[PDB]
């Protein structure tokens, strides 16, 4: 396999500003802030994840593993790592996705979300996953909650917490016993802890169903324990009301038992691109037809998105 010559930038703490707290937890804390590289007339909006405890070796190995993965894949439609900071508590510096997770977005703006946006998001998530397949990366946790909103027009995959790089000449990843989201997993992942690009496709299909339902929960009210049996008996998620047969047939194909009978992300890109050219022909939706405050700072002249920084 090819040498992985990704670059990992180490950042000084003095060259970023934590402005606000987006979220906290036992994992750590995620700040909103600005990164000003010393000597460059540039200010980069960032999300900064800092560990709560500096003394957990397991937490430090996992955070660096996440950094390794993200640095090894740099692209649009993938949330970008800018660097890490090796302070008392390790910090990941990431590109700020101001509008949160797509799952929250469709739930808060269902009434104002049209077919054009829904299909473009589907195209974008496909381009992202097709890039990850090129990098021999298997995401293992694709879900509407793990796609974030840069702008309403532009979404990006993230939470590479469970993402695993495939070894050279290997097409499957055999995982150990661990907490994993059953409702988004392919049947072979559930029964045999097997993950591939094609199991990623299964999850893509569930992700699209979340979007097409405006944020509903798959198999709501059903224990994850009987999911395996439901899938084996041939059940699948139902057709969402706005979805023409054309769209739903794509989703269904994603949920075949034979992983090689599921589409490839390249084909999902093409097919959703076609539908994005005439969106109201494929989704029937009722009624279809400078932000310095965001950064809580006044001087925004030299602001540059990470997607333009190198
Ligand atoms: C627990 C998993 C998770 O992604 N947590 C989390 C918590 C807080 C913010 C973000 C986040 C956000 C983010 C999340 C929520 C919001 N909203 C919430 C809804 N509200 C109405 C407006 C503000 C805005 C931005 N943007 C990010 N960009 C890059 N990395 C991130 O997190 C990475 C470093 C883990 C994040 C993510």
Residue numbers in the entry: 697 to 985, 997 to 1017
What does the paper say about this structure?
Ligand-induced EGFR receptor tyrosine kinase activation promotes downstream signaling which triggers cell proliferation and survival. Sensitizing mutations such as L858R or delE746_A750 in the EGFR kinase domain render the receptor constitutively activated, independent of an extracellular ligand-binding event. Acquired resistance to these targeted drugs is caused by a secondary mutation in EGFR (T790M) at the gatekeeper position that occurs in 60% of the patients, inducing steric hindrance to the first generation inhibitors and thereby preventing inhibitor binding. Herein, we present covalent inhibitors of the drug resistant gatekeeper mutant EGFR-L858R/T790M based on the pyrrolopyrimidine scaffold.
To our delight, we were able to solve two co-crystal structures of potent inhibitors in complex with EGFR-T790M/C797S. This is the first report of X-ray crystal structures with covalent inhibitors reversibly binding to C797S drug resistant EGFR. Outstanding potency was observed with compounds 19g and 19h, possessing the iso-propyl and iso-butyl ethers in the 4-position, showing EC50 values of 38 and 51 nM, respectively. O-Substituted inhibitors 19d, g and h were the most potent among this series of compounds and showed high activities of around 9 nM in the biochemical assay. The iso-propoxy- and iso-butoxy moieties form large interaction surfaces with the gatekeeper methionines, rather than steric interfering with the side chains as observed with pyrrolopyrimidin-4-ones. As previously anticipated, this might contribute to the high potency and reversible binding efficiency observed with these compounds. However, due to the C797S mutation, the acrylamide warhead adopts a position distant from the side chain and does not form any protein contact which might account for its high flexibility and only partial resolution covering this moiety. Interestingly, we observed an influence of the spatial size of the residue in 4-position on the orientation of the warhead and its linker. The sterically more demanding iso-butyl residue pushes the linker towards the mutated Ser797 side chain, which indicates that increasing the size of this substituent facilitates a ligand conformation that might more effectively target Cys797 in a non-C797S-mutant EGFR kinase. Accordingly, a high potency against EGFR-L858R/T790M/C797S was found especially for the O4-substituted compounds, which were found to take advantage of favorable interactions with the methionine gatekeeper based on analysis of two obtained X-ray co-crystal structures in complex with C797S-mutated EGFR.
